[PDB]
Amino acid sequence: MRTRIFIGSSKEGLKEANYVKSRLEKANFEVFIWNDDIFKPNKNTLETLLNVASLFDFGIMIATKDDFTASRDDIFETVRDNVVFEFGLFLGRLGENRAFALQENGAKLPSDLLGITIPKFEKTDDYFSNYNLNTEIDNIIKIINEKISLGELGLLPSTVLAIGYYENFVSTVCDALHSLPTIKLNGIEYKDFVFNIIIPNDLDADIKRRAQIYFKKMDIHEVKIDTSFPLYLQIDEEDVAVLYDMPTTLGGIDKAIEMYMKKGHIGKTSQQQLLEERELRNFKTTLINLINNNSFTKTFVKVIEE
Amino acid sequence: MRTRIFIGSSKEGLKEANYVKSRLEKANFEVFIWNDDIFKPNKNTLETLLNVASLFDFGIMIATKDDFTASRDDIFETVRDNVVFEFGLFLGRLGENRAFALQENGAKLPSDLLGITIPKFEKTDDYFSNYNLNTEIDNIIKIINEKISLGELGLLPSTVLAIGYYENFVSTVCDALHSLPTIKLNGIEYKDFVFNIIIPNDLDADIKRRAQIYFKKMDIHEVKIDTNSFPLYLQIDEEDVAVLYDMPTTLGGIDKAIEMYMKKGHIGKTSQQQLLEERELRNFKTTLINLINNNSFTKTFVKVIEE
Amino acid sequence: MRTRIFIGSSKEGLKEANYVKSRLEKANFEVFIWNDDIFKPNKNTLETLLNVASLFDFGIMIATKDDFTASRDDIFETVRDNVVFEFGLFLGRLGENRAFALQENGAKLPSDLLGITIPKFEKTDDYFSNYNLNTEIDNIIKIINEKISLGELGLLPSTVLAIGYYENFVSTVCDALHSLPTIKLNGIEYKDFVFNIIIPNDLDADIKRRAQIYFKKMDIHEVKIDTSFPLYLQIDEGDVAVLYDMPTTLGGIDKAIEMYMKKGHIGKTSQQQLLEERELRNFKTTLINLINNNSFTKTFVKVIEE
Amino acid sequence: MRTRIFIGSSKEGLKEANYVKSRLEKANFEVFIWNDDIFKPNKNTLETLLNVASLFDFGIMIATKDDFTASRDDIFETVRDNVVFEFGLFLGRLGENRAFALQENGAKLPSDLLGITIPKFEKTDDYFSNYNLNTEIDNIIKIINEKISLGELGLLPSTVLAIGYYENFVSTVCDALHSLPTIKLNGIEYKDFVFNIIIPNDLDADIKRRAQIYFKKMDIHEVKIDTSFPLYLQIDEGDVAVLYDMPTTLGGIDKAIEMYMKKGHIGKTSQQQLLEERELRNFKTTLINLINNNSFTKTFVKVIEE
Amino acid sequence: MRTRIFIGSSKEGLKEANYVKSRLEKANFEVFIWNDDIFKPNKNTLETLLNVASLFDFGIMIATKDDFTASRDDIFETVRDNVVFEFGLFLGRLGENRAFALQENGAKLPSDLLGITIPKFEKTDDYFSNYNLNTEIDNIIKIINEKISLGELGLLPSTVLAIGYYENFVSTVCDALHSLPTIKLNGIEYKDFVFNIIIPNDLDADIKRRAQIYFKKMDIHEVKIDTSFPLYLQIDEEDVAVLYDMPTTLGGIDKAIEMYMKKGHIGKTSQQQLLEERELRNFKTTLINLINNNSFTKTFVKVIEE
Ligand SMILES: Nc1nc2c(ncn2[C@@H]2O[C@@H]3COP(=O)(O)O[C@H]4[C@@H](O)[C@H](n5cnc6c(=O)[nH]c(N)nc65)O[C@@H]4COP(=O)(O)O[C@H]3[C@H]2O)c(=O)[nH]1
């Protein structure tokens, strides 16, 4: 599991990037250099980099001098432009504050560009005692670690569903419950409520049917929550008021990942499952982060995995 | 049994095709190179190619270099275009997601086309120790094994029967049964139901009569299932588990389809006709079990078994 | 749990070793060429060939033209010396009717060498279209098939222990039981009897204690059958008598494995388990073959697994 | 708290040592090069090597070209002299099947050192693109992983104490208790019995006092069973009997640990605790391995933590 | 018998090694040089060294000048390195305070290295009139004679087993006996006791059986002693209270010896007997040194040999 990190080179930036690969791998980061195992069918790294978004999460770049003077290329000509095309495409397919890079001293790229620092580091044939790259890597580990728990992906189709679900259902039900004296559900009068959100492991095809069977199987009866339209939710019967729900909105991301890749294959494919897991984990992270923002939701709304 | 795989080389790469034959056969894949024994009565490989669809399931080829300059041929002239003619006709008769290829480093064939990646390998006269071709064969096996369990054959006459059967009968009765409180079947009230589908080994001649004589001897009583839209006639066994049974009545469709697929001029059943029956039935089983494992109303309550 | 074949070849004739490995593996024959990961510990092929007698069952060698004409050699001063040395040491550690060979049609090694007619083949590029070599491999395969249940001819101590066990306990017990109606057996008549033999699933240090524990688990008494000295075995309390006994002589073969495998290693190794299981399989095969060969014990003794 | 490995190199080959520790820690082996903060109290690498006979488990070292050709050296008159003397000290204090060696393509070290296959590598700049070095480190890793759970070779007194304890107490008591139905046990019958062995988490001087205190914590009475002399153990009052005992023989190993270190210092250090607990874990592993090798105790005794 | 010392010179200190051999013999220290008769099967001195620990007790190294300049070697190269590897591995197999050395005037070794003073001596072809090396052999003697009774060998299994024996058994029985007014042993009351320990001449196979067979034929009956766990011992009846015991802990060192040497060699060997005697004498020395230091053990616990 863990976060996927991608470092890019044309034909010579291999080992001075593999050092960062190994150090990040020491921190349980599945960092895949551009030629480990995924990109073997892909003849070039450009067709891989055009698929880095929402597939290889964060990324780093390393460039040196040995591929900066003169060389002929196969797919392109004047390969000296291929490195900067790679850098620009990688920075465009990830977004700012999510795509990092470094370069060698004397690399024909500016030290700073687009508000992202691109330090130039030394040669130091063996790098383990080069305590200038080391601080940068120690920093990047903790900066990325801050950006798994923080889902600043508002453009992504998962996060928009997450924020819509949170703000328009969880916030609404919690605000409605703090209106009448304590709680008015199914005749009996409760005192406190802890909302439960159950995110499925795999979405498959349709979500409403799964929610229906899941609620039927666990002996859960409907409730009325009045707020514009009153909300229908689910409560467990065994005054604690353990409210339960499954996000119905996940059908949107289900269809999105179905259409995202050319799918002429009945049933679930491993790539489809991996994309499913990525989108759902980002949805879960965004939902938790929004939950941890509002004071009325600090502790009264919990999300669990089943 | 197992999957059937085809490999195609013109007249000089047959050795590196035999190597892939051996490696696939080590993974329980039945592999028939285009000159094993079946195609000997066939005068050329092109009739075998026009008889490869729905018969050899998946397909592969190996592209070479030593037959790429000039040579005279019997059926054709300028045989040097037959490598790409093979690669085109073979991706035609089998379709995408059912045809693969491997090619030499720098071979005179397209690097990629039609969404089918064609990985490259070098000659390596020490073939068994080339950890580039072996990786390609390993991942081709891993790709294939993901396509036995998932039947992407919507054009096939069996997969459409599977989709129709599921969507119009199994999903329909599953939706109908989750309408009334627990169960209302023949007056008596059970709690939960287990739909069971029985796919025969062979379809014989007619399916309705086979169902009638199967359920006359196993002593199962009929039931009325009323959906929102015509009621679905099913049968529930009497011995509170509600084990509903049914056999796909529509398998006679695929029986007739593969009777008309091949020229059947002989009365009675035939070995090749049996092979086509088994192929279509296993594809139907795969498609139905995949559609069952999709919808949550069907994953558990509906099970397909072999009688 | 299948037969193992060791294929030995020079560093330049490894292609034929690989091809024969594939051909034998097509018959469910676990084949280990001298260059697998198991032999990375050992330094040279001579060390791995020295202990091939019991570790690797049968074997086969391939001698090629490129390692038989000119090379400087490392262990010896001449590869021409080397190849005949490995052939000799292999044919010595395995002996007659337990080792074969192959070589090029033009090799100076003669066809018949103290037995086992050594066939010929040609360097025909890719070998999947050689009828001669394939026919050779096929009759080799049928040879191992016909000599896997025959047993041994004075080989590893499993067979001699099996012969001793049968001819000194089983036959004498059965003769004693048939010499008169099986009436007494501690005062209760039984008519027919069954003598069940239970092979311990692994050689576990001292073996009589294991038999005592296993028999005590089933609440099994001791009977007193008379034959020179009376023989004592177990009964399992009268239409058909049932009698049990566990091979106690396997302690000797376990201790023999202990000596053969030099061990300052305090514990069990995968190598020790492999040798133990192979030698128990040999003992079991010898015993079953020899009990179905005879007439008194054709049907009245059953060998099973615990 | 895992396996530990010590890697030593000259002041210039520290690059190779760093790469090897990277490779080993990628395969879950805690590796300490001589340059760490642990060896600051020691003066020279020879004095760090002074106590590596048992402190740092397995060890491997590296020699290069120009730390083995010409230099002045500080401790000796020649760096070649220093490297060969240091390798001699390591190979002596570690021995066979517990040490390994790597050396540069031009190194003058012999390919054989009274055994132990010496691999061979080169200065290929950054070491993440070295196939042969990676494979040899991988075989080392597999050897270490398949070797750490076996036992010892007459090494630190943990293994000899384990063998003595088992073969003089556990086997004797188990054999005496299975020699007859466990009926008496001070006048009350139990049939089956369980012989629970508790390993103390840490060694604190005298251990029989610790045993008495711990047994009194559970209100345990003493029993007497006859076997030479009657062996007295503790019971835990009856379908299945249960017996307890913690190794009293650990007093000898604790005193050995105290004597092997300085006397003037009072109070335990982190180093003492680490070495002590490591060797205690070794004793526990040896005991459980020997138990699963034996017959009576395979399923009838339990070794657990206090 | 007496102390055994191994001395090492490569090819030019042979006369210088024989002189130190003679001067150690003058103090009755049996000296085996590396090529008397034992090491004839060993092709090189390196495989002689790989068994020098615990077999040849002490050690002395002799350094010569004509073996320091230049000479091609067989097992190594640049015998300048081979002698130093010798001096390092010999120190690694014996350690500090158990390994001494002598070096020629101007020899390329430190004057003081690793806590071993390496004294200087010139050639002096007539060695018997050299009052420099005679004085140094004298101080070697007065160092060694202090180190037979003092067994500071806490690493060696014999010493740790002895420490365990004393501290866990003899101290406990002495403390229990000096508790009630005079004596309460088998009902009868005595006044003073002489506990006695019978060190076996040979490790046999299991000291349990030897203990029973020895105590049965002296008509010695068991005694009950109460201290955690009670103590069972042996007392003779013919008020002197001669209690008896036999060290049962010697089983561990036994199995350690027969596992230390690879044993496919059934039966005892001269090497086995030599290790036997060395381990037994070390155990007896350690126990008798621990006994006289204490006050409760100096007088009432005597060690005897049958
Ligand atoms: N609760 C209990 N445990 C037992 C008994 N006998 C042996 N053990 C356990 O087995 C350890 C080693 O026993 P050993 O090899 O026979 O060698 C033993 C033995 O030769 C002797 N020894 C120890 N305890 C006794 C004893 O209670 N009676 C006698 N006669 N000798 C003893 O000292 C050696 C080391 O003893 P330890 O350090 O104590 O460690 C002992 C102890 O943990 C017993 O009667 N009761």
Numbering used by the authors:
A (entry chain D), E (entry chain E): 1 to 227, 231 to 241, 245 to 312
B (entry chain C): 1 to 228, 231 to 241, 245 to 312
C (entry chain B), D (entry chain H): 1 to 227, 231 to 240, 244 to 312
What's the publication's text?
Here, we resolve cryo-EM structures of Epilithonimonas lactis TIR-STING (ElSTING) bound to 3′3′-c-di-GMP, revealing two oligomeric states: spiral-shaped single filaments and fiber bundles composed of straight protofibrils. The overall structure of the ElSTING dimer closely resembles that of the SfSTING dimer, comprising an N-terminal TIR domain and a C-terminal STING domain, connected by a linker. Functional assays confirmed that 3′3′-c-di-GMP is the sole CDN capable of activating ElSTING-mediated NAD+ degradation, cleaving NAD+ into ADP-ribose (ADPr) and nicotinamide (NAM) as observed in SfSTING homologs.
The structure of the fiber bundle was resolved at 3.7 Å resolution. In contrast to the spiral architecture of ElSTING single filaments, protofibrils within the ElSTING fiber bundle adopt a straight configuration, mirroring the linear assembly observed in SfSTING filaments. Notably, the interactions between the TIR domains of protofibrils contribute to their assembly. Although F39 remains buried, upward displacement of the CBDα4 helix disrupts its interactions with the hydrophobic core, likely permitting NAD+ binding to trigger F39 flipping and active site assembly. Notably, residue Q278 occupies the site which was previously held by the calcium ion, while residues K269 and K274 establish charge-charge interactions with E264 and E282, respectively. Collectively, these structural and mechanistic parallels confirm that the ElSTING fiber bundle represents its active form, underscoring the role of conformational dynamics in STING-mediated activation.
